[PDB]
Write an enzyme that holds these catalytic residues in place. Structure first.
Site, short mmCIF file in Angstrom:
data_model
loop_
_atom_site.label_atom_id
_atom_site.label_comp_id
_atom_site.label_asym_id
_atom_site.label_seq_id
_atom_site.Cartn_x
_atom_site.Cartn_y
_atom_site.Cartn_z
N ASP A 21 -6.79 73.08 -2.98
CA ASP A 21 -7.53 74.18 -3.58
C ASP A 21 -6.58 75.24 -4.16
OD1 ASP A 21 -9.60 75.79 -4.39
OD2 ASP A 21 -10.13 76.48 -2.35
N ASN A 69 -18.08 70.21 -7.87
CA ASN A 69 -17.27 70.57 -9.04
C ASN A 69 -17.93 70.18 -10.36
OD1 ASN A 69 -13.94 70.07 -7.58
ND2 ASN A 69 -15.28 71.88 -7.64
#
Ligand SMILES: Cc1cc(N2CCCCCC2)n2ncc(-c3ccc(F)cc3)c2n1
Ligand SMILES: Cc1cc(N2CCCCCC2)n2ncc(-c3ccc(F)cc3)c2n1
Lengths: 236, 236
Positions: A21, A69
């Site tokens: 991330d 996502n």
């Protein structure tokens, strides 16, 4: 403080799992477009893959693209979906020389065919290698994975091939996308978020977690070794 | 730094879940027997229960006894199994006045009948209350819970009451021990361990985690409010 030969002293997790991330926030911080950061993160993937393979890690599982996502802007989604080709076009021969086995976990039917085509040739080109296993988690989510285990087991019960009383913990594990792979002893998550985000929920029942404020593009070998140093402090 | 009225400013998690670890190490540190620490932790339970209920928390879920705790010495196991009676004998009327609903999650068939008898009268005595829900997780494990969901769903498919294509995420959730309860927005774990230890694996897919080095018997109201302050900083 730790360095490498101090880490080989001790236990090396056979299976490490990383939530990669902080690519967007790394580009934002440098006044760069967010897609620049995704591209930078792509390098740190193979740099981390090489170090873990020297250390003797046996499975590296990296969360590349989450089911959630899909909701990002379409220009970014399409660029993220072009990253596997770019990554393999750049590093696949290196990964073949290094004896790596490239594998994929997630729902692949949802990827563009040009992205799937490229991945599947990587998998085949490294099939007959027996070295470290490099698992890209792509369109992967833990709850979906658990439900599809249940549905598969249910379907075999429906057909008479499976008695309900033979369903136990270990049998359940074999219907997860992780198949027979061992559970990760160590989970690493960058970018300062302290949560699991629906990643490998069953498989990290007993994993040690290491969270770092370092953003993924900034996650070089010393941060990685320091995360391993933490792991070696953990007991019971 | 935070204090209470600064916390009511913001969002209060409707459901908080706490791994109440570090009782043994708190007694060891005071040159006390480990069972002293279990007993001290019992007070902080109701002290934390009262504060969360004023704040407007709607579900408090506390991990009291893990499936793996059976392996501790038998004198300790039997003492831990006497703590629910002692806790309810001391606090149940208070919990009735406070409108609390006492509930239990885990495999109860494994508890001594004197421990079960006491718990079940607590549940009934607070059944017709509609206030905060106090969930003790007792002999609870996430993998077992997930397998028993799968086995239950499988059994209904076997009997023709359930088609496989109607098994989805939300349906799966209803066969977990947490029934229709909402997932915890906030998970707290004391004693400096950074892991999940097979607790509520499905249910914390998206929960925020707050780990503290404070041992559970030392986890007074300010540590609790500070954990809530962290929670309010978390985004996306
Ligand atoms: C979507 C995506 C994003 C992606 N990033 C690189 C840094 C991680 C964070 C997202 C951006 N990377 N990096 C490698 C792959 C990949 C995937 C499959 C495969 F077989 C080989 C490599 C990848 N895939
Ligand atoms: C085994 C055990 C241990 C226990 N400790 C108190 C501190 C937590 C760590 C272990 C020691 N507590 N505290 C309350 C209960 C309880 C259980 C069921 C119920 F209906 C009401 C209260 C409890 N149960």
């Amino acid at each position: 403080r730790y360095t490498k030969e101090d880490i080989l002293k001790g236990e090396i997790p056979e299976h490490i799992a990383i939530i990669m991330d902080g690519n967007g926030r790394w580009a934002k911080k440098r006044s760069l477009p967010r897609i620049a950061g995704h591209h930078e993160g792509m390098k740190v993937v193979k740099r981390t893959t090489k170090l873990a393979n020297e250390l003797g890690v046996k499975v590296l599982t990296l969360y590349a693209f989450s089911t959630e996502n899909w909701k990002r802007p379409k220009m970014e989604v399409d660029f993220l979906m072009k990253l596997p080709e770019e990554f393999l076009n750049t590093y696949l021969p290196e990964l073949v020389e290094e004896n790596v086995q490239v594998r994929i976990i997630g729902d692949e039917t949802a990827l563009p065919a040009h992205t799937l085509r490229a991945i599947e040739k990587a998998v085949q080109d490294t099939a007959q290698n027996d070295g470290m296993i490099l698992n890209f988690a792509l369109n992967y989510g833990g709850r979906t994975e658990i439900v599809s285990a249940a549905k598969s087991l249910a379907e075999k019960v429906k057909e008479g091939s499976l008695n309900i009383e033979d369903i136990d913990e270990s049998l359940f594990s074999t219907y997860l996308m992780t198949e027979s792979l061992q559970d990760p002893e160590l989970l690493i998550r960058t970018s300062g978020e302290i949560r699991l985000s629906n990643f490998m929920l069953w498989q990290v029942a007993y994993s040690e977690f290491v969270f770092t404020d370092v953003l993924w593009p900034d996650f070089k070998e010393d941060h990685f070794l320091q995360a391993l140093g933490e792991f070696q402090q953990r007991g019971r």
